[PDB]
Protein backbone atom coordinates (compact mmCIF):
# COMPACT_ATOMS: atom_id res chain seq x y z
CA UNK A 1 0.00 0.00 0.00
CA UNK A 2 2.09 2.90 -1.30
CA UNK A 3 0.24 6.16 -1.96
CA UNK A 4 -3.55 6.10 -1.87
CA UNK A 5 -5.38 6.94 -5.08
CA UNK A 6 -6.44 10.61 -4.92
CA UNK A 7 -9.95 11.65 -6.01
CA UNK A 8 -11.12 15.25 -6.11
CA UNK A 9 -14.81 16.07 -6.42
CA UNK A 10 -16.49 19.39 -7.13
CA UNK A 11 -18.72 19.40 -4.04
CA UNK A 12 -19.35 17.61 -0.78
CA UNK A 13 -22.28 15.30 -1.64
CA UNK A 14 -20.23 13.51 -4.30
CA UNK A 15 -17.21 13.46 -1.97
CA UNK A 16 -19.12 11.42 0.61
CA UNK A 17 -20.72 9.00 -1.85
CA UNK A 18 -17.35 8.44 -3.52
CA UNK A 19 -15.54 7.99 -0.18
CA UNK A 20 -17.93 5.17 0.69
CA UNK A 21 -17.06 3.44 -2.58
CA UNK A 22 -13.34 4.21 -2.20
CA UNK A 23 -13.19 2.81 1.33
CA UNK A 24 -9.57 2.48 2.44
CA UNK A 25 -7.83 2.45 -0.97
CA UNK A 26 -8.53 6.04 -2.05
CA UNK A 27 -8.82 9.45 -0.41
CA UNK A 28 -11.61 11.71 -1.69
CA UNK A 29 -11.63 15.48 -1.20
CA UNK A 30 -14.11 18.18 -2.23
CA UNK A 31 -13.10 21.41 -3.95
CA UNK A 32 -15.86 23.40 -2.24
CA UNK A 33 -16.03 23.60 1.54
CA UNK A 34 -19.11 22.62 3.56
CA UNK A 35 -21.64 25.45 3.51
CA UNK A 36 -20.20 27.12 0.40
CA UNK A 37 -22.51 27.98 -2.49
CA UNK A 38 -21.71 25.51 -5.28
CA UNK A 39 -23.46 26.75 -8.43
CA UNK A 40 -21.53 30.00 -8.91
CA UNK A 41 -18.42 29.14 -6.89
CA UNK A 42 -15.31 31.01 -8.04
CA UNK A 43 -12.28 28.68 -8.12
CA UNK A 44 -8.93 29.85 -6.72
CA UNK A 45 -5.30 29.04 -7.56
CA UNK A 46 -5.39 26.74 -4.53
CA UNK A 47 -8.28 24.81 -6.09
CA UNK A 48 -6.23 24.38 -9.26
CA UNK A 49 -3.43 22.91 -7.15
CA UNK A 50 -5.76 20.43 -5.50
CA UNK A 51 -7.34 19.26 -8.77
CA UNK A 52 -3.95 19.02 -10.53
CA UNK A 53 -2.60 16.76 -7.76
CA UNK A 54 -5.55 14.37 -8.14
CA UNK A 55 -5.65 11.06 -9.98
CA UNK A 56 -9.36 11.42 -10.83
CA UNK A 57 -11.83 14.33 -10.84
CA UNK A 58 -15.58 13.79 -10.38
CA UNK A 59 -18.33 16.30 -11.11
CA UNK A 60 -22.13 16.36 -11.34
CA UNK A 61 -22.70 17.86 -14.74
CA UNK A 62 -26.35 18.58 -15.55
CA UNK A 63 -25.59 22.32 -15.36
CA UNK A 64 -24.65 22.26 -11.66
CA UNK A 65 -21.09 23.60 -11.57
CA UNK A 66 -21.13 26.66 -13.82
CA UNK A 67 -17.42 27.00 -13.09
CA UNK A 68 -16.20 23.48 -13.75
CA UNK A 69 -15.52 23.29 -17.47
CA UNK A 70 -13.48 26.53 -17.54
CA UNK A 71 -11.66 25.40 -14.39
CA UNK A 72 -10.88 21.92 -15.75
CA UNK A 73 -9.15 23.41 -18.81
CA UNK A 74 -6.31 24.48 -16.48
CA UNK A 75 -5.79 20.84 -15.44
CA UNK A 76 -3.37 18.59 -17.35
CA UNK A 77 -3.49 14.79 -17.69
CA UNK A 78 -6.04 14.20 -14.91
CA UNK A 79 -9.07 12.14 -16.03
CA UNK A 80 -12.56 13.33 -15.20
CA UNK A 81 -15.93 11.62 -15.02
CA UNK A 82 -19.45 13.04 -14.87
CA UNK A 83 -21.38 11.05 -12.28
CA UNK A 84 -24.96 11.63 -13.55
CA UNK A 85 -24.80 9.60 -16.78
CA UNK A 86 -28.00 7.62 -17.25
CA UNK A 87 -30.20 9.79 -15.00
CA UNK A 88 -33.29 11.19 -16.71
CA UNK A 89 -33.40 14.93 -15.94
CA UNK A 90 -36.29 17.10 -14.87
CA UNK A 91 -36.28 20.47 -16.67
CA UNK A 92 -36.10 23.75 -14.81
CA UNK A 93 -39.54 25.30 -15.15
CA UNK A 94 -38.95 29.06 -15.46
CA UNK A 95 -36.38 31.84 -15.33
CA UNK A 96 -33.28 32.26 -17.49
CA UNK A 97 -32.31 28.60 -16.98
CA UNK A 98 -35.76 27.33 -17.98
CA UNK A 99 -35.74 24.12 -19.98
CA UNK A 100 -32.28 22.85 -19.06
CA UNK A 101 -31.73 19.94 -16.68
CA UNK A 102 -32.31 20.57 -12.99
CA UNK A 103 -28.94 19.47 -11.52
CA UNK A 104 -30.11 18.31 -8.08
CA UNK A 105 -30.61 14.66 -9.09
CA UNK A 106 -29.03 13.27 -5.89
CA UNK A 107 -32.08 14.18 -3.79
CA UNK A 108 -33.84 11.07 -5.10
CA UNK A 109 -32.48 7.96 -3.33
CA UNK A 110 -33.28 5.99 -6.50
CA UNK A 111 -31.02 8.33 -8.47
CA UNK A 112 -28.29 7.96 -5.85
CA UNK A 113 -27.98 4.32 -6.94
CA UNK A 114 -27.04 5.57 -10.41
CA UNK A 115 -24.50 8.00 -8.90
CA UNK A 116 -22.96 5.02 -7.11
CA UNK A 117 -22.72 2.92 -10.26
CA UNK A 118 -21.12 5.78 -12.23
CA UNK A 119 -18.56 6.49 -9.49
CA UNK A 120 -17.77 2.77 -9.24
CA UNK A 121 -17.20 2.55 -13.00
CA UNK A 122 -14.90 5.59 -12.95
CA UNK A 123 -12.84 4.27 -10.05
CA UNK A 124 -12.56 0.83 -11.63
CA UNK A 125 -11.53 2.37 -14.96
CA UNK A 126 -8.81 4.66 -13.62
CA UNK A 127 -7.56 2.60 -10.64
CA UNK A 128 -8.05 -0.96 -11.94
CA UNK A 129 -5.62 -2.46 -9.42
CA UNK A 130 -8.27 -1.93 -6.71
CA UNK A 131 -11.34 -2.85 -8.79
CA UNK A 132 -12.37 -5.66 -6.42
CA UNK A 133 -12.41 -3.27 -3.44
CA UNK A 134 -14.43 -0.60 -5.29
CA UNK A 135 -16.89 -3.24 -6.48
CA UNK A 136 -17.37 -4.70 -3.00
CA UNK A 137 -17.68 -1.26 -1.40
CA UNK A 138 -20.18 -0.04 -4.01
CA UNK A 139 -22.34 -3.14 -3.54
CA UNK A 140 -22.47 -2.63 0.24
CA UNK A 141 -23.21 1.09 -0.02
CA UNK A 142 -25.87 0.60 -2.70
CA UNK A 143 -27.55 -1.85 -0.33
CA UNK A 144 -27.75 0.86 2.33
CA UNK A 145 -29.03 3.47 -0.12
CA UNK A 146 -31.62 1.07 -1.57
CA UNK A 147 -32.93 0.22 1.91
CA UNK A 148 -33.14 3.93 2.74
CA UNK A 149 -36.05 4.60 0.37
CA UNK A 150 -38.85 2.63 2.04
CA UNK A 151 -38.84 4.30 5.50
CA UNK A 152 -38.53 7.76 3.94
CA UNK A 153 -41.36 7.06 1.52
CA UNK A 154 -43.54 5.78 4.36
CA UNK A 155 -42.81 8.83 6.54
CA UNK A 156 -43.76 11.34 3.85
CA UNK A 157 -46.78 9.27 2.80
CA UNK A 158 -48.35 10.26 6.14
CA UNK A 159 -48.88 13.78 4.78
CA UNK A 160 -52.25 13.83 2.94
CA UNK A 161 -51.56 13.86 -0.79
CA UNK A 162 -53.56 17.05 -1.39
CA UNK A 163 -51.45 18.84 1.24
CA UNK A 164 -48.07 17.71 -0.18
CA UNK A 165 -46.75 21.16 -1.09
CA UNK A 166 -42.98 21.60 -0.69
CA UNK A 167 -42.21 25.34 -0.47
CA UNK A 168 -38.48 26.06 -0.48
CA UNK A 169 -36.10 28.89 -1.42
CA UNK A 170 -34.17 27.31 -4.28
CA UNK A 171 -36.20 24.88 -6.39
CA UNK A 172 -33.58 22.26 -5.54
CA UNK A 173 -35.99 19.51 -4.49
CA UNK A 174 -37.71 18.62 -7.78
CA UNK A 175 -36.41 15.04 -7.84
CA UNK A 176 -37.36 14.34 -4.23
CA UNK A 177 -40.74 15.97 -4.89
CA UNK A 178 -41.32 13.69 -7.87
CA UNK A 179 -40.38 10.51 -5.97
CA UNK A 180 -42.64 11.24 -3.01
CA UNK A 181 -45.49 13.06 -4.76
CA UNK A 182 -45.07 16.67 -3.61
CA UNK A 183 -46.14 19.75 -5.52
CA UNK A 184 -43.25 22.15 -5.73
CA UNK A 185 -43.17 25.89 -4.92
CA UNK A 186 -40.00 27.96 -4.68
CA UNK A 187 -38.67 31.49 -4.45
CA UNK A 188 -36.18 30.95 -7.30
CA UNK A 189 -35.77 27.99 -9.68
CA UNK A 190 -31.97 27.64 -9.38
CA UNK A 191 -29.24 29.53 -7.57
CA UNK A 192 -28.09 32.45 -9.72
CA UNK A 193 -28.41 36.25 -9.89
CA UNK A 194 -31.88 37.00 -8.48
CA UNK A 195 -32.85 35.23 -5.23
CA UNK A 196 -35.80 36.69 -3.33
CA UNK A 197 -36.60 39.61 -5.66
CA UNK A 198 -40.23 40.80 -5.72
CA UNK A 199 -42.44 38.90 -8.21
CA UNK A 200 -40.90 35.70 -6.81
CA UNK A 201 -41.94 36.35 -3.21
CA UNK A 202 -45.38 37.57 -4.27
CA UNK A 203 -46.15 34.44 -6.30
CA UNK A 204 -45.12 32.10 -3.47
CA UNK A 205 -47.17 34.11 -0.96
CA UNK A 206 -50.19 33.72 -3.27
CA UNK A 207 -49.96 29.92 -3.50
CA UNK A 208 -49.39 29.54 0.24
CA UNK A 209 -52.50 31.55 1.07
CA UNK A 210 -54.70 29.89 -1.55
CA UNK A 211 -53.74 26.37 -0.43
CA UNK A 212 -53.15 27.05 3.30
CA UNK A 213 -49.69 25.52 3.06
CA UNK A 214 -48.46 25.18 6.65
CA UNK A 215 -44.68 25.54 6.28
CA UNK A 216 -41.86 27.01 4.15
CA UNK A 217 -38.14 26.18 4.15
CA UNK A 218 -34.70 27.57 3.42
CA UNK A 219 -31.52 25.68 2.50
CA UNK A 220 -28.10 25.49 4.07
CA UNK A 221 -25.96 27.40 1.52
CA UNK A 222 -28.28 30.38 0.88
CA UNK A 223 -29.93 33.13 2.93
CA UNK A 224 -32.87 32.31 5.20
CA UNK A 225 -34.24 35.86 4.94
CA UNK A 226 -36.60 35.37 1.95
CA UNK A 227 -38.16 32.26 3.52
CA UNK A 228 -38.58 33.99 6.88
CA UNK A 229 -40.18 36.97 5.12
CA UNK A 230 -42.64 34.61 3.44
CA UNK A 231 -43.52 32.97 6.76
CA UNK A 232 -43.94 36.32 8.53
CA UNK A 233 -46.49 37.51 5.95
CA UNK A 234 -48.44 34.23 5.69
CA UNK A 235 -49.88 31.65 8.04
CA UNK A 236 -46.95 29.33 7.32
CA UNK A 237 -44.34 28.46 9.89
CA UNK A 238 -40.67 28.72 9.01
CA UNK A 239 -39.67 25.06 8.99
CA UNK A 240 -35.92 25.57 9.19
CA UNK A 241 -33.14 24.70 6.80
CA UNK A 242 -33.03 21.73 4.46
CA UNK A 243 -29.74 20.28 3.24
CA UNK A 244 -29.32 19.79 -0.52
CA UNK A 245 -26.27 21.56 -1.94
CA UNK A 246 -23.83 20.78 0.88
CA UNK A 247 -23.12 18.52 3.82
CA UNK A 248 -22.27 20.07 7.14
CA UNK A 249 -18.80 19.75 8.53
CA UNK A 250 -17.83 16.28 9.73
CA UNK A 251 -18.51 17.40 13.31
CA UNK A 252 -21.85 18.97 12.36
CA UNK A 253 -25.28 17.32 12.21
CA UNK A 254 -25.23 16.44 8.47
CA UNK A 255 -21.82 14.78 7.93
CA UNK A 256 -22.84 12.25 5.25
CA UNK A 257 -25.08 11.84 2.21
CA UNK A 258 -27.24 9.38 4.17
CA UNK A 259 -27.57 11.94 6.96
CA UNK A 260 -28.49 14.62 4.41
CA UNK A 261 -31.41 12.67 2.94
CA UNK A 262 -32.56 11.62 6.42
CA UNK A 263 -32.32 15.16 7.83
CA UNK A 264 -34.10 16.79 4.90
CA UNK A 265 -36.97 14.28 4.97
CA UNK A 266 -37.23 14.49 8.76
CA UNK A 267 -37.28 18.30 8.70
CA UNK A 268 -40.01 18.29 6.03
CA UNK A 269 -42.12 15.79 7.97
CA UNK A 270 -41.77 17.82 11.17
CA UNK A 271 -42.82 20.95 9.31
CA UNK A 272 -46.08 19.14 8.53
CA UNK A 273 -46.52 17.84 12.09
CA UNK A 274 -45.08 14.39 11.19
Ligand SMILES: [Zn+2]
Nearest residue numbers: 170172191245
Ligand atom coordinates in the same frame (compact mmCIF):
# COMPACT_ATOMS: atom_id res chain seq x y z
ZN1 LIG B 1 -28.69 24.20 -5.61
